[PDB]
Amino acid sequence: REMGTVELLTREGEIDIAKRIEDGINQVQCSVAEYPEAITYLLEQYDRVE
DNA sequence: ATTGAGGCTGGTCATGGCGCTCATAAATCTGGTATACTTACCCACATTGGGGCTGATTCTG
Numbered sequence: 072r073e074m075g076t077v078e079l080l081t082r083e084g085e086i087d088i089a090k091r092i093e094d095g096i097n098q099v100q101c102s103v104a105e106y107p108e109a110i111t112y113l114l115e116q117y118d119r120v121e
Numbered sequence: 122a123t124t125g126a127g128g129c130t131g132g133t134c135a136t137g138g139c140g141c142t143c144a145t146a147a148a149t150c151t152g153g154t155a156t157a158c159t160t161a162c163c164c165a166c167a168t169t170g171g172g173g174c175t176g177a178t179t180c181t182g
Contacts, residue, residue: 075161 080088103109 072161079160
């Protein structure tokens, strides 16, 4: 019953949801790249690798 | 009742198979990713409790 309360998608809905996911991921990526501590941790990890 | 020897009490010198410990290594055990399209399973009794009536005392239009 709980599963059938919802209706399946189509190709257009799948494309729209994928686009929304990509947009959210891009926004999160921009927000986390806008900080310098990310670059600091990247450099520290690269130094540890080297 | 002594002093002359055997049997038996003290320690020598390694000795030798056994057991714990180190290290190698291939077999065994774990985590991980696959892109034509696949969308709702398969007997008979006795007792107590819950729900729908059934009046029967209280109030009503």
